[PDB]
Write a protein that binds this ligand. Structure first.
Ligand code: LYD
Ligand code: LYD
Ligand code: UMP
Ligand code: UMP
Lengths: 264, 264
């Protein structure tokens, strides 16, 4: 997409070299904002075929409050394998914090239920937020949340959402993360009878790994194509009732996919 | 300052009338980002006179982990009077979360020292984060955190910081908020023998209250002046050791102040 490629180039022109926790190395910039009007189309990268089946199951996995890759495997999604333990657990990551944030006194907060109820009863609220950054449980996570904090907003009947991503692998993770939240917004909007607004992406340490330069240059040579459109074929009775079969992407004509090693 | 004024005119150019919690009504935009190169000078608003004294005391107060206004009163700062209960308490707000975020297994995390140790021992970490958004204690707070989440970043010997402010009163709070974090960045940098980099402000619900319109355009008709300089006269043994007197702002020649009612 225009802004994606735009950021991709910015990291190359401006990035500083950094030794990261993975002894790989990166080119990064700190602080960046991107804006996607969902009305213009679903923001699934077209300059490289992205596979939505993985994106959808992960999100659904999040919403169920699941942190074990078992489910992902049942649907043959392999993206979190390199992080799970011998039992397939990742710890209290995303899912756990979204659906059952543990209070100091032993009980749990269902942030999603809270958000749905806010959008329906108090959309003008400026506190419609979900946070995966649970300071007291970080040490228990296999990896600290990257898309860590997000807020919803309603205006003129449209639902917008801004995500704060503290760490971003521009080549591998970003195309994935963007489509994920765009999807969620579409689901929230349907469940709250609202139109989709903007998806604002804000990043902290935004980087490009050294061993991704070739595929990054290859990707920068391609012309972005018109964005697909998302169709939700069934309207579930709750935001926790969606299933893979309910989503159809239309008009998605991407450039060939690009293979690249992940930093572990 | 240029960035600040440009933000104001932006809310005015594309803000949407919104009703709000206080019943005052706002002109609101969602999603924004601006940068301040601290080396250019201290980002204290010059188009109106600001109370440096109050800003400093509030920050010192936060760093002490305090949440009762008595301290602010000892030093003639009344900016938190409206939300304090009969005993002067605001609940586990900013200070308490910064210095003692309670975990579900009985521990407390001092996020400030944590961050200090990270900048000294692992500055290239992408997890140097302080969060005030403790979803489990939100309901015990007088007011939910506005400047809710911030990240630090080190590049080429310079310390930068990005703040995510989920709700922003552009006329009244923003000037204070920007100066307050730029101050924090200087302190941290002094304690880590680093140079100051950029302060990146990112906003969620960024608004102008309906009853701030006149004063807003009045300010908008003024020319920014040169930015003041921040001078720290002492390097305390710890970041929790600073005193009001250690700070001296030089060259601050602002326009006349402008009074405006705070929505409670
Ligand atoms: C062929 C595909 C499997 C391949 N995609 C990926 O490798 C991948 C892996 C994990 C994630 C989830 C987010 C994530 C978790 N941990 C991570 N670690 C890194 N370095 N980057 C990430 O994005 C993530 C998204 C994408 C592709 O070619 O598109
Ligand atoms: C002369 C000054 C006293 C005046 N400033 C303020 O009144 C003010 C009050 C509280 C805060 C802290 C954040 C805050 C707490 N509660 C809030 N409530 C609202 N509506 N907005 C805010 O910014 C805050 C910052 C600024 C000025 O002219 O600058
Ligand atoms: C909160 C505190 C601060 O440091 N700066 C501010 O700008 N804000 C403002 C935002 C909003 O106008 C009010 C908080 O109310 P709400 O929780 O957003 O309903 O204080
Ligand atoms: O869904 C994800 C998960 C991780 N990251 C990337 C950010 C970093 O490249 C790496 C995480 O490493 P740390 O930031 O924790 O060091 O994974 C993403 O962009 N998206």
């Amino acid at each position: 997409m225009k802004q994606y490629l735009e950021l991709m180039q910015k990291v190359l022109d401006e990035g500083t070299q950094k030794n990261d926790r993975t002894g790989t190395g990166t080119l990064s910039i700190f602080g960046h904002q991107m804006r996607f009007n969902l009305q213009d189309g679903f923001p699934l990268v077209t300059t490289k075929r992205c596979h939505l089946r993985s994106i959808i199951h992960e999100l659904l996995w999040f919403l169920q409050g699941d942190t074990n890759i078992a489910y992902l495997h049942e649907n043959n999604v392999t993206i979190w394998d390199e992080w799970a333990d011998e039992n397939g657990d990742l710890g209290p990551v995303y899912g756990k914090q979204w659906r059952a944030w543990p209070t100091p006194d032993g009980r749990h907060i269902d942030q999603i239920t809270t958000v749905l109820n806010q959008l329906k009863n108090d959309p003008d609220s400026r506190r419609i937020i979900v946070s995966a950054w649970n300071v007291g449980e970080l040490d228990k996570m296999a990896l600290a949340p990257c898309h860590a904090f997000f807020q919803f907003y309603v205006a003129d009947g449209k639902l917008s959402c801004q995500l704060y991503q503290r760490s971003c692998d521009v080549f591998l993770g970003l195309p994935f993360n963007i489509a994920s939240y765009a999807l969620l917004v579409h689901m929230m909007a349907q469940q709250c009878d609202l139109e989709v607004g903007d998806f604002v992406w804000t990043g902290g340490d935004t980087h490009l790994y050294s061993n991704h330069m070739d595929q990054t240059h290859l990707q920068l040579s391609r012309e972005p194509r018109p964005l697909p459109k998302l169709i939700i074929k069934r309207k579930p009775e709750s935001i926790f009732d969606y299933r893979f079969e309910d989503f159809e992407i239309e008009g998605y004509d991407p450039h060939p996919g690009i293979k690249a090693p992940v930093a572990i």
